[PDB]
Structures are given as structure tokens and as C-alpha cells.
Amino acid sequence: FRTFPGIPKWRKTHLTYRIVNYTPDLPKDAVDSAVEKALKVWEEVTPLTFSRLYEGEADIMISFAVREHGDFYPFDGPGNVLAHAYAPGPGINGDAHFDDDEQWTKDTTGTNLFLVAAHEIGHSLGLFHSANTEALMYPLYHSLTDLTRFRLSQDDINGIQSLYGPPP
Ligand SMILES: CC1(c2ccc(Oc3ccccc3)cc2)C(=O)NC(=O)NC1=O
Ligand SMILES: [Ca+2]
Ligand SMILES: [Ca+2]
Ligand SMILES: [Ca+2]
Ligand SMILES: [Zn+2]
Ligand SMILES: [Zn+2]
């Protein structure tokens, strides 16, 4: 696994998140379901807990946008960058942005929102890109022959427990 330069990480285990807006591609309840599941993948193997806010500034502000959207890294239309996220820290740090020029899905038919969100949350928690082809944090998108098979690799678990420890 890799961490970011200087190893920034949250200095607390109870984190907040806010879904600021929604992609047209799925029902809101599906987006909420995909986001909750992506957070739980990391909650289950650490002491971290995520609490949903509906207004104000959460630690992890999740939003969907296209092209230029208020940071130094514009999106780029369909394909290429799918989303991006910032390492732990205040303000824009920790936030996750999803390119709404992608087609977001709940399955294998497009760009799986759960999958990509799970990878971005890794970044929001302090993990960079792994060299392991089976890691969730490996930098190469691939959807899945059955999502029910999905499992964090040991490389992802060890990265995240190195920063935050195992569940108490
Ligand atoms: C290219 C890239 C990305 C995003 C989500 C991914 O989801 C995965 C990761 C591994 C396996 C299957 C899906 C993969 C790459 C990635 O490297 N980093 C990222 O933050 N956004 C991106 O678009
Ligand atoms: Ca894109
Ligand atoms: Ca933030
Ligand atoms: Ca879209
Ligand atoms: Zn952005
Ligand atoms: Zn990545």
C-alpha cells in the first residue's frame, strides 16, 4: 500500500460526511446506498465511524460536477478521470468529487458508483495508490463479475489499519 507524502491522516475516528448533491444517473436512494456501503468497507476494519450530515461542513464533502468545479483539477468529460479525492485535513482535504460526465451505475453496465466511491474514500482516509493488482487502491478501474464477491485486499486492510488501528 502507499500513503500520501508526510502521511496526513484524520486525528479522530468519528468522521462526518455530507452528500451535497446527486447525479442524474441513479435514484438518490441508490446513490445513498452506494456511498454508505463504500464507507462501511473501511469502517468494518478500523475504529472509524462515519456520521451523515445534511447541511454545513462535514469532514468529507461528496459532490458530483463536470469540468471546472472549483479546485485545481478540472474533470475531463466521459472516461479518463472518474472522480478524485483529497487526503485528510481541513477544508477541501478529505473531500470526494465524482465526474458527472461519467455514466454512474449500480452494476457492471457502466462505471460502478459503489466501487469508485470505495476507492475514493480510501484516498479521503489517507491511502494513496497500491502496486497490488488486487487492491481496491490499485489505480486501475475494473468493474466486477459480481459485486457480491467484492472484498478489500489484505494490502488495503493493512494500509488502513497501519493508520487507524483495527476495530476496538
Ligand atoms: C483513475 C482513478 C480510479 C478511481 C476509482 C477506481 O475504482 C476501482 C479501483 C480498483 C479496482 C476497481 C475499481 C480506480 C481508479 C484513480 O487512480 N484515482 C482516483 O482517485 N480517481 C480515478 O479516476
Ligand atoms: Ca472523466
Ligand atoms: Ca473536507
Ligand atoms: Ca452522469
Ligand atoms: Zn475536484
Ligand atoms: Zn486513486
Short mmCIF file of N, CA and C and ligand atoms in Angstrom, two decimals:
data_model
loop_
_atom_site.label_atom_id
_atom_site.label_comp_id
_atom_site.label_asym_id
_atom_site.label_seq_id
_atom_site.Cartn_x
_atom_site.Cartn_y
_atom_site.Cartn_z
N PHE A 1 0.91 -1.22 0.00
CA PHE A 1 0.00 0.00 0.00
C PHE A 1 0.90 1.21 0.00
N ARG A 2 0.34 2.40 -0.24
CA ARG A 2 1.15 3.61 -0.09
C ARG A 2 0.33 4.64 0.69
N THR A 3 0.98 5.59 1.35
CA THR A 3 0.22 6.66 1.99
C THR A 3 0.60 7.93 1.22
N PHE A 4 0.06 9.10 1.55
CA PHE A 4 0.45 10.33 0.87
C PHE A 4 1.75 10.84 1.51
N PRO A 5 2.45 11.74 0.85
CA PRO A 5 3.67 12.36 1.38
C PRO A 5 3.44 12.96 2.75
N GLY A 6 4.25 12.59 3.73
CA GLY A 6 4.05 13.13 5.08
C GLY A 6 2.97 12.36 5.85
N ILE A 7 2.30 11.41 5.17
CA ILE A 7 1.30 10.63 5.88
C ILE A 7 0.23 11.41 6.65
N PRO A 8 -0.48 12.29 5.99
CA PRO A 8 -1.59 13.00 6.62
C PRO A 8 -2.68 11.98 6.96
N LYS A 9 -3.35 12.06 8.10
CA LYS A 9 -4.45 11.13 8.40
C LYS A 9 -5.40 11.88 9.35
N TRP A 10 -6.62 11.45 9.50
CA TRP A 10 -7.52 12.13 10.42
C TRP A 10 -7.02 11.95 11.85
N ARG A 11 -7.17 12.99 12.65
CA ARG A 11 -6.73 12.93 14.05
C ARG A 11 -7.89 12.65 14.99
N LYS A 12 -8.79 11.81 14.51
CA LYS A 12 -10.01 11.45 15.23
C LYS A 12 -10.63 10.27 14.51
N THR A 13 -11.45 9.45 15.15
CA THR A 13 -12.10 8.34 14.50
C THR A 13 -13.56 8.59 14.12
N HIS A 14 -14.20 9.61 14.67
CA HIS A 14 -15.62 9.84 14.33
C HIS A 14 -15.64 10.94 13.27
N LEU A 15 -15.92 10.52 12.04
CA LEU A 15 -15.86 11.44 10.90
C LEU A 15 -17.28 11.71 10.39
N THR A 16 -17.42 12.88 9.76
CA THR A 16 -18.74 13.20 9.19
C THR A 16 -18.60 13.27 7.67
N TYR A 17 -19.75 13.04 7.01
CA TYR A 17 -19.75 13.16 5.55
C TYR A 17 -21.06 13.82 5.13
N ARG A 18 -21.06 14.49 4.00
CA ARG A 18 -22.31 15.09 3.53
C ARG A 18 -22.41 14.79 2.02
N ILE A 19 -23.57 14.34 1.54
CA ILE A 19 -23.73 14.13 0.09
C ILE A 19 -24.36 15.45 -0.38
N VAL A 20 -23.53 16.33 -0.89
CA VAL A 20 -24.01 17.68 -1.22
C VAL A 20 -25.01 17.77 -2.31
N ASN A 21 -24.84 16.88 -3.31
CA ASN A 21 -25.75 16.88 -4.46
C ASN A 21 -25.75 15.48 -5.11
N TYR A 22 -26.57 15.27 -6.12
CA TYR A 22 -26.74 13.94 -6.71
C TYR A 22 -26.67 13.91 -8.23
N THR A 23 -26.11 12.83 -8.77
CA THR A 23 -26.01 12.57 -10.20
C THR A 23 -27.41 12.27 -10.68
N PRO A 24 -27.68 12.67 -11.93
CA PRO A 24 -28.97 12.35 -12.54
C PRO A 24 -29.12 10.87 -12.84
N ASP A 25 -28.05 10.13 -12.92
CA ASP A 25 -27.98 8.76 -13.37
C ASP A 25 -28.65 7.70 -12.51
N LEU A 26 -28.91 8.00 -11.27
CA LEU A 26 -29.47 6.93 -10.39
C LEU A 26 -30.45 7.56 -9.47
N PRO A 27 -31.34 6.82 -8.86
CA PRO A 27 -32.19 7.37 -7.83
C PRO A 27 -31.34 7.75 -6.62
N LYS A 28 -31.77 8.80 -5.90
CA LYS A 28 -31.00 9.27 -4.75
C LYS A 28 -30.73 8.15 -3.77
N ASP A 29 -31.76 7.33 -3.54
CA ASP A 29 -31.62 6.22 -2.58
C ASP A 29 -30.51 5.27 -3.01
N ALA A 30 -30.34 5.08 -4.32
CA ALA A 30 -29.24 4.24 -4.77
C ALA A 30 -27.86 4.87 -4.50
N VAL A 31 -27.79 6.19 -4.74
CA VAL A 31 -26.52 6.89 -4.50
C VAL A 31 -26.26 6.76 -2.99
N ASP A 32 -27.28 6.92 -2.18
CA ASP A 32 -27.05 6.90 -0.71
C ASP A 32 -26.57 5.50 -0.30
N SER A 33 -27.24 4.50 -0.88
CA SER A 33 -26.86 3.11 -0.63
C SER A 33 -25.43 2.83 -1.05
N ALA A 34 -25.01 3.28 -2.25
CA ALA A 34 -23.65 3.05 -2.71
C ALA A 34 -22.58 3.72 -1.85
N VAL A 35 -22.88 4.94 -1.41
CA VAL A 35 -21.99 5.71 -0.55
C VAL A 35 -21.90 5.03 0.83
N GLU A 36 -23.02 4.69 1.45
CA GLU A 36 -22.97 4.04 2.75
C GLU A 36 -22.15 2.74 2.74
N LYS A 37 -22.36 1.94 1.70
CA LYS A 37 -21.63 0.68 1.54
C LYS A 37 -20.15 0.94 1.36
N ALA A 38 -19.75 1.97 0.59
CA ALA A 38 -18.35 2.26 0.40
C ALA A 38 -17.71 2.67 1.74
N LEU A 39 -18.46 3.41 2.56
CA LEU A 39 -17.88 3.84 3.85
C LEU A 39 -17.75 2.62 4.78
N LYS A 40 -18.79 1.80 4.78
CA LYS A 40 -18.76 0.61 5.65
C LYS A 40 -17.58 -0.31 5.35
N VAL A 41 -17.16 -0.42 4.07
CA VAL A 41 -16.00 -1.26 3.75
C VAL A 41 -14.80 -0.88 4.63
N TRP A 42 -14.54 0.41 4.84
CA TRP A 42 -13.46 0.91 5.65
C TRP A 42 -13.85 0.95 7.12
N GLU A 43 -15.10 1.30 7.46
CA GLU A 43 -15.49 1.24 8.88
C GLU A 43 -15.31 -0.15 9.49
N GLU A 44 -15.66 -1.19 8.70
CA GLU A 44 -15.63 -2.52 9.30
C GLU A 44 -14.20 -2.91 9.74
N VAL A 45 -13.12 -2.35 9.17
CA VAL A 45 -11.80 -2.86 9.59
C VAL A 45 -10.97 -1.88 10.39
N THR A 46 -11.58 -0.81 10.91
CA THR A 46 -10.93 0.17 11.75
C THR A 46 -11.87 0.61 12.88
N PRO A 47 -11.50 1.49 13.76
CA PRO A 47 -12.36 2.12 14.73
C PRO A 47 -13.14 3.26 14.09
N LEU A 48 -12.85 3.61 12.79
CA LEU A 48 -13.55 4.79 12.25
C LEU A 48 -15.08 4.60 12.25
N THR A 49 -15.85 5.67 12.43
CA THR A 49 -17.31 5.67 12.31
C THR A 49 -17.67 6.92 11.45
N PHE A 50 -18.59 6.77 10.53
CA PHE A 50 -18.99 7.88 9.67
C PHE A 50 -20.41 8.31 10.05
N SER A 51 -20.62 9.62 10.19
CA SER A 51 -21.94 10.12 10.55
C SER A 51 -22.43 11.03 9.43
N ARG A 52 -23.66 10.84 8.97
CA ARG A 52 -24.11 11.65 7.81
C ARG A 52 -24.66 13.01 8.26
N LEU A 53 -24.16 14.10 7.67
CA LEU A 53 -24.74 15.42 7.90
C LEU A 53 -25.60 15.83 6.70
N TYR A 54 -26.62 16.66 6.88
CA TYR A 54 -27.46 17.14 5.76
C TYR A 54 -27.30 18.64 5.49
N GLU A 55 -26.40 19.28 6.20
CA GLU A 55 -26.09 20.70 5.98
C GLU A 55 -24.78 21.02 6.66
N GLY A 56 -24.19 22.18 6.34
CA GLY A 56 -22.94 22.55 6.96
C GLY A 56 -21.73 21.82 6.41
N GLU A 57 -20.60 22.00 7.11
CA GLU A 57 -19.36 21.42 6.59
C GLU A 57 -18.99 20.09 7.22
N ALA A 58 -19.17 19.01 6.45
CA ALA A 58 -18.74 17.70 7.03
C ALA A 58 -17.26 17.52 6.71
N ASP A 59 -16.61 16.56 7.40
CA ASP A 59 -15.21 16.28 7.07
C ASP A 59 -15.10 15.92 5.58
N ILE A 60 -15.92 14.99 5.14
CA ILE A 60 -15.85 14.50 3.75
C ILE A 60 -17.10 15.01 3.00
N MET A 61 -16.89 16.03 2.17
CA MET A 61 -17.95 16.63 1.38
C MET A 61 -17.95 15.89 0.03
N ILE A 62 -19.02 15.17 -0.27
CA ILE A 62 -19.11 14.41 -1.51
C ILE A 62 -19.99 15.20 -2.50
N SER A 63 -19.54 15.34 -3.73
CA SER A 63 -20.29 16.10 -4.73
C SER A 63 -20.00 15.58 -6.15
N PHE A 64 -20.96 15.87 -7.02
CA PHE A 64 -20.89 15.45 -8.43
C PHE A 64 -20.80 16.76 -9.24
N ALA A 65 -19.90 16.84 -10.20
CA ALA A 65 -19.69 18.03 -11.01
C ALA A 65 -19.02 17.61 -12.34
N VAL A 66 -19.01 18.53 -13.29
CA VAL A 66 -18.26 18.29 -14.56
C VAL A 66 -17.21 19.37 -14.75
N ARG A 67 -16.22 19.08 -15.57
CA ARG A 67 -15.18 20.03 -15.96
C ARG A 67 -14.71 20.85 -14.79
N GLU A 68 -14.57 22.17 -14.99
CA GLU A 68 -14.11 23.03 -13.89
C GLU A 68 -15.14 23.10 -12.77
N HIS A 69 -14.74 22.80 -11.55
CA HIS A 69 -15.71 22.77 -10.45
C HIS A 69 -15.23 23.32 -9.12
N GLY A 70 -14.19 24.13 -9.16
CA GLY A 70 -13.71 24.84 -8.01
C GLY A 70 -12.46 24.41 -7.31
N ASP A 71 -11.65 23.56 -7.93
CA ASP A 71 -10.36 23.18 -7.40
C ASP A 71 -9.35 23.25 -8.57
N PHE A 72 -8.12 22.84 -8.29
CA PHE A 72 -7.09 22.92 -9.33
C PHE A 72 -7.13 21.76 -10.30
N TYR A 73 -8.09 20.86 -10.26
CA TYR A 73 -8.08 19.68 -11.14
C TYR A 73 -9.42 19.45 -11.79
N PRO A 74 -9.67 20.17 -12.88
CA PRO A 74 -10.91 20.05 -13.61
C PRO A 74 -11.26 18.64 -14.05
N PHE A 75 -12.54 18.29 -14.15
CA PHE A 75 -12.83 16.97 -14.71
C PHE A 75 -12.63 17.05 -16.24
N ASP A 76 -12.87 15.96 -16.92
CA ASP A 76 -12.42 15.89 -18.33
C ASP A 76 -13.37 15.23 -19.30
N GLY A 77 -14.65 15.24 -19.01
CA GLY A 77 -15.62 14.57 -19.84
C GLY A 77 -15.64 13.07 -19.58
N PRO A 78 -16.37 12.36 -20.41
CA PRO A 78 -16.55 10.90 -20.30
C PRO A 78 -15.23 10.17 -20.25
N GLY A 79 -15.08 9.11 -19.47
CA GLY A 79 -13.78 8.41 -19.46
C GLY A 79 -12.67 9.08 -18.70
N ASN A 80 -11.40 8.62 -18.81
CA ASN A 80 -10.26 9.12 -18.13
C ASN A 80 -10.47 9.33 -16.61
N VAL A 81 -10.23 10.49 -16.02
CA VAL A 81 -10.52 10.59 -14.56
C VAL A 81 -11.99 10.33 -14.27
N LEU A 82 -12.33 9.42 -13.35
CA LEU A 82 -13.72 9.16 -12.99
C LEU A 82 -14.21 10.02 -11.81
N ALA A 83 -13.31 10.32 -10.94
CA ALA A 83 -13.54 11.02 -9.68
C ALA A 83 -12.19 11.33 -9.07
N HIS A 84 -12.17 12.08 -7.94
CA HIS A 84 -10.90 12.28 -7.28
C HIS A 84 -11.21 12.69 -5.82
N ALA A 85 -10.21 12.56 -4.97
CA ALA A 85 -10.44 12.88 -3.57
C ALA A 85 -9.16 13.42 -2.93
N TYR A 86 -9.33 14.13 -1.82
CA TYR A 86 -8.17 14.72 -1.17
C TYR A 86 -7.79 13.96 0.10
N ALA A 87 -6.52 13.89 0.44
CA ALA A 87 -6.07 13.32 1.69
C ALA A 87 -6.65 14.03 2.91
N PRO A 88 -6.59 13.44 4.11
CA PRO A 88 -7.14 14.01 5.33
C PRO A 88 -6.64 15.40 5.63
N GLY A 89 -7.47 16.21 6.30
CA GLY A 89 -7.07 17.58 6.60
C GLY A 89 -8.37 18.42 6.53
N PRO A 90 -8.22 19.69 6.81
CA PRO A 90 -9.36 20.61 6.86
C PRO A 90 -9.78 21.11 5.50
N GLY A 91 -10.95 21.74 5.41
CA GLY A 91 -11.48 22.30 4.18
C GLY A 91 -11.62 21.29 3.06
N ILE A 92 -10.98 21.62 1.93
CA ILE A 92 -11.10 20.71 0.76
C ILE A 92 -10.45 19.37 1.08
N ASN A 93 -9.53 19.33 2.04
CA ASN A 93 -8.97 18.00 2.37
C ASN A 93 -10.07 17.05 2.80
N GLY A 94 -9.94 15.77 2.41
CA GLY A 94 -10.88 14.73 2.73
C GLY A 94 -12.02 14.68 1.73
N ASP A 95 -12.26 15.72 0.88
CA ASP A 95 -13.43 15.72 0.06
C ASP A 95 -13.31 14.79 -1.16
N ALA A 96 -14.44 14.38 -1.63
CA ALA A 96 -14.50 13.46 -2.77
C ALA A 96 -15.41 14.02 -3.86
N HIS A 97 -14.88 14.07 -5.08
CA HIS A 97 -15.66 14.60 -6.20
C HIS A 97 -15.80 13.55 -7.31
N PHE A 98 -17.01 13.45 -7.84
CA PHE A 98 -17.36 12.44 -8.84
C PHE A 98 -17.71 13.12 -10.18
N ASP A 99 -17.01 12.70 -11.23
CA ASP A 99 -17.24 13.32 -12.56
C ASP A 99 -18.59 12.96 -13.08
N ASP A 100 -19.51 13.92 -13.16
CA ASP A 100 -20.83 13.60 -13.67
C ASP A 100 -20.87 13.58 -15.22
N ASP A 101 -19.76 13.49 -15.89
CA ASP A 101 -19.75 13.22 -17.34
C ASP A 101 -19.61 11.70 -17.52
N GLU A 102 -19.43 10.98 -16.37
CA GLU A 102 -19.43 9.50 -16.48
C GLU A 102 -20.86 9.00 -16.46
N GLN A 103 -21.13 7.73 -16.78
CA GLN A 103 -22.47 7.20 -16.61
C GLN A 103 -22.41 6.40 -15.30
N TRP A 104 -23.04 6.87 -14.22
CA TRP A 104 -22.93 6.12 -12.98
C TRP A 104 -23.98 5.00 -12.90
N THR A 105 -23.49 3.81 -12.51
CA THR A 105 -24.39 2.70 -12.29
C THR A 105 -24.29 2.01 -10.93
N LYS A 106 -25.31 1.20 -10.69
CA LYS A 106 -25.38 0.27 -9.59
C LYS A 106 -24.91 -1.12 -10.03
N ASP A 107 -24.42 -1.31 -11.26
CA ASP A 107 -23.99 -2.65 -11.65
C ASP A 107 -22.68 -2.67 -12.40
N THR A 108 -22.60 -3.61 -13.35
CA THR A 108 -21.44 -3.75 -14.22
C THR A 108 -21.60 -2.98 -15.53
N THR A 109 -22.83 -2.63 -15.86
CA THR A 109 -23.13 -1.94 -17.10
C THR A 109 -22.51 -0.57 -17.30
N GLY A 110 -21.91 0.09 -16.30
CA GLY A 110 -21.32 1.40 -16.63
C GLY A 110 -20.06 1.62 -15.81
N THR A 111 -20.11 2.66 -14.98
CA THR A 111 -18.99 2.95 -14.08
C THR A 111 -19.65 2.78 -12.71
N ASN A 112 -19.25 1.75 -11.97
CA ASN A 112 -19.93 1.44 -10.72
C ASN A 112 -19.69 2.51 -9.65
N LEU A 113 -20.74 3.13 -9.14
CA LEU A 113 -20.55 4.21 -8.16
C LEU A 113 -19.99 3.66 -6.83
N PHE A 114 -20.54 2.56 -6.33
CA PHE A 114 -20.01 1.96 -5.10
C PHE A 114 -18.52 1.75 -5.20
N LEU A 115 -18.09 1.10 -6.28
CA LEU A 115 -16.70 0.74 -6.47
C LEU A 115 -15.80 1.97 -6.43
N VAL A 116 -16.16 2.95 -7.25
CA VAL A 116 -15.30 4.14 -7.36
C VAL A 116 -15.32 4.92 -6.03
N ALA A 117 -16.50 5.05 -5.45
CA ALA A 117 -16.60 5.74 -4.16
C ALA A 117 -15.76 5.00 -3.10
N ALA A 118 -15.76 3.66 -3.14
CA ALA A 118 -14.96 2.94 -2.12
C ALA A 118 -13.50 3.28 -2.29
N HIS A 119 -12.99 3.31 -3.54
CA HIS A 119 -11.63 3.70 -3.82
C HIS A 119 -11.37 5.17 -3.40
N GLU A 120 -12.31 6.07 -3.75
CA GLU A 120 -12.04 7.49 -3.35
C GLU A 120 -11.98 7.64 -1.82
N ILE A 121 -12.87 6.99 -1.10
CA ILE A 121 -12.87 7.10 0.37
C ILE A 121 -11.52 6.64 0.95
N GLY A 122 -10.91 5.66 0.28
CA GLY A 122 -9.56 5.22 0.68
C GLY A 122 -8.67 6.48 0.65
N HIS A 123 -8.77 7.25 -0.45
CA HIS A 123 -7.94 8.44 -0.57
C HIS A 123 -8.33 9.47 0.53
N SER A 124 -9.60 9.63 0.77
CA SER A 124 -10.07 10.58 1.78
C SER A 124 -9.56 10.19 3.18
N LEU A 125 -9.25 8.92 3.35
CA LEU A 125 -8.76 8.44 4.64
C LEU A 125 -7.24 8.41 4.70
N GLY A 126 -6.54 8.67 3.60
CA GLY A 126 -5.07 8.77 3.72
C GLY A 126 -4.35 7.68 2.92
N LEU A 127 -5.03 6.89 2.11
CA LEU A 127 -4.26 5.89 1.35
C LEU A 127 -4.06 6.42 -0.07
N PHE A 128 -2.86 6.23 -0.57
CA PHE A 128 -2.60 6.54 -1.98
C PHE A 128 -2.70 5.22 -2.73
N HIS A 129 -2.08 5.18 -3.92
CA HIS A 129 -2.19 4.06 -4.84
C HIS A 129 -1.25 2.91 -4.48
N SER A 130 -1.84 1.73 -4.51
CA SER A 130 -1.14 0.48 -4.29
C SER A 130 -0.56 -0.04 -5.62
N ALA A 131 0.40 -0.92 -5.45
CA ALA A 131 1.12 -1.62 -6.51
C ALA A 131 0.47 -2.98 -6.66
N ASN A 132 -0.39 -3.37 -5.69
CA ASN A 132 -1.11 -4.64 -5.78
C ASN A 132 -2.33 -4.69 -6.71
N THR A 133 -2.31 -5.48 -7.80
CA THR A 133 -3.36 -5.55 -8.78
C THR A 133 -4.74 -5.92 -8.27
N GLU A 134 -4.77 -6.65 -7.17
CA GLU A 134 -5.99 -6.98 -6.49
C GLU A 134 -6.33 -5.93 -5.41
N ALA A 135 -5.56 -4.87 -5.21
CA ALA A 135 -6.04 -3.95 -4.16
C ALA A 135 -7.17 -3.04 -4.58
N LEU A 136 -8.07 -2.64 -3.70
CA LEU A 136 -9.07 -1.65 -4.07
C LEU A 136 -8.36 -0.36 -4.44
N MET A 137 -7.23 -0.07 -3.79
CA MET A 137 -6.47 1.14 -4.02
C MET A 137 -5.54 1.04 -5.25
N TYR A 138 -5.59 -0.04 -6.01
CA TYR A 138 -4.77 -0.14 -7.25
C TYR A 138 -5.35 0.89 -8.24
N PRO A 139 -4.57 1.63 -8.98
CA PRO A 139 -5.12 2.77 -9.73
C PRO A 139 -5.79 2.47 -11.04
N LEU A 140 -6.23 1.24 -11.23
CA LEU A 140 -6.82 0.86 -12.50
C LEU A 140 -8.26 0.40 -12.31
N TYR A 141 -9.18 1.24 -12.77
CA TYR A 141 -10.58 0.84 -12.69
C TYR A 141 -10.84 -0.48 -13.42
N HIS A 142 -11.71 -1.30 -12.87
CA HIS A 142 -12.20 -2.53 -13.47
C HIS A 142 -13.55 -2.72 -12.76
N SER A 143 -14.63 -3.02 -13.45
CA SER A 143 -15.89 -3.27 -12.73
C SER A 143 -15.82 -4.72 -12.24
N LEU A 144 -16.88 -5.33 -11.74
CA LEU A 144 -16.73 -6.70 -11.26
C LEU A 144 -17.72 -7.76 -11.71
N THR A 145 -17.17 -8.91 -12.11
CA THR A 145 -18.02 -10.06 -12.41
C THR A 145 -18.58 -10.38 -11.01
N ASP A 146 -19.74 -9.79 -10.73
CA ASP A 146 -20.37 -9.96 -9.42
C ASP A 146 -19.68 -9.12 -8.35
N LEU A 147 -20.47 -8.16 -7.85
CA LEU A 147 -20.04 -7.24 -6.82
C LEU A 147 -20.12 -7.92 -5.46
N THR A 148 -21.04 -8.90 -5.35
CA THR A 148 -21.17 -9.61 -4.08
C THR A 148 -19.83 -10.31 -3.76
N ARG A 149 -18.96 -10.48 -4.74
CA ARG A 149 -17.67 -11.09 -4.46
C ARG A 149 -16.69 -10.09 -3.85
N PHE A 150 -16.88 -8.79 -4.11
CA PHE A 150 -16.00 -7.74 -3.60
C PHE A 150 -15.50 -7.93 -2.17
N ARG A 151 -14.21 -7.67 -2.01
CA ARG A 151 -13.55 -7.74 -0.71
C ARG A 151 -12.27 -6.91 -0.78
N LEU A 152 -12.04 -6.16 0.27
CA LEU A 152 -10.82 -5.40 0.40
C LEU A 152 -9.67 -6.40 0.35
N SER A 153 -8.56 -6.05 -0.22
CA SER A 153 -7.42 -6.94 -0.15
C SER A 153 -6.78 -6.74 1.23
N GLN A 154 -5.86 -7.64 1.52
CA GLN A 154 -5.06 -7.57 2.74
C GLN A 154 -4.16 -6.34 2.67
N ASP A 155 -3.75 -5.99 1.47
CA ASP A 155 -2.92 -4.80 1.27
C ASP A 155 -3.74 -3.56 1.70
N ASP A 156 -5.02 -3.48 1.29
CA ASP A 156 -5.84 -2.32 1.70
C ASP A 156 -6.09 -2.31 3.22
N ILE A 157 -6.39 -3.49 3.75
CA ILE A 157 -6.64 -3.59 5.21
C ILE A 157 -5.44 -3.16 6.03
N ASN A 158 -4.27 -3.61 5.64
CA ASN A 158 -3.01 -3.31 6.35
C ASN A 158 -2.70 -1.84 6.19
N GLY A 159 -2.97 -1.30 4.98
CA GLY A 159 -2.70 0.16 4.84
C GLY A 159 -3.57 0.95 5.86
N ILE A 160 -4.87 0.71 5.82
CA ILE A 160 -5.83 1.42 6.65
C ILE A 160 -5.66 1.13 8.13
N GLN A 161 -5.27 -0.08 8.52
CA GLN A 161 -5.06 -0.36 9.98
C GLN A 161 -3.72 0.21 10.40
N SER A 162 -2.73 0.33 9.50
CA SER A 162 -1.49 0.97 9.88
C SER A 162 -1.74 2.43 10.32
N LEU A 163 -2.68 3.08 9.63
CA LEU A 163 -3.01 4.48 10.01
C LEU A 163 -3.94 4.57 11.21
N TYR A 164 -4.97 3.76 11.30
CA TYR A 164 -6.02 3.91 12.31
C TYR A 164 -6.13 2.77 13.31
N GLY A 165 -5.49 1.64 13.09
CA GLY A 165 -5.63 0.50 14.02
C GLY A 165 -6.80 -0.38 13.61
N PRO A 166 -7.01 -1.50 14.27
CA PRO A 166 -8.13 -2.40 13.98
C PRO A 166 -9.37 -1.97 14.76
N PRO A 167 -10.52 -2.51 14.55
CA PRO A 167 -11.70 -2.24 15.35
C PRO A 167 -11.44 -2.55 16.84
N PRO A 168 -11.83 -1.71 17.77
CA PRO A 168 -11.60 -1.95 19.21
C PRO A 168 -12.39 -3.13 19.72
C1 LIG B 1 -8.04 6.54 -12.12
C2 LIG B 1 -8.72 6.65 -10.71
C3 LIG B 1 -9.63 5.45 -10.19
C4 LIG B 1 -10.88 5.70 -9.48
C5 LIG B 1 -11.64 4.62 -8.99
C6 LIG B 1 -11.23 3.28 -9.13
O1 LIG B 1 -12.05 2.24 -8.65
C7 LIG B 1 -11.51 0.91 -8.67
C8 LIG B 1 -10.18 0.64 -8.19
C9 LIG B 1 -9.65 -0.68 -8.27
C10 LIG B 1 -10.46 -1.69 -8.83
C11 LIG B 1 -11.78 -1.46 -9.35
C12 LIG B 1 -12.31 -0.12 -9.26
C13 LIG B 1 -9.99 3.01 -9.82
C14 LIG B 1 -9.22 4.08 -10.35
C15 LIG B 1 -7.66 6.59 -9.58
O2 LIG B 1 -6.50 6.18 -9.78
N1 LIG B 1 -7.73 7.55 -8.59
C16 LIG B 1 -8.84 8.31 -8.38
O3 LIG B 1 -8.85 8.95 -7.29
N2 LIG B 1 -9.69 8.53 -9.45
C17 LIG B 1 -9.57 7.93 -10.66
O4 LIG B 1 -10.35 8.13 -11.61
CA CA B 2 -13.93 11.82 -16.69
CA CA B 3 -13.06 18.32 3.91
CA CA B 4 -23.61 11.39 -15.44
ZN ZN B 5 -12.43 18.25 -7.70
ZN ZN B 6 -6.99 6.65 -6.93
#
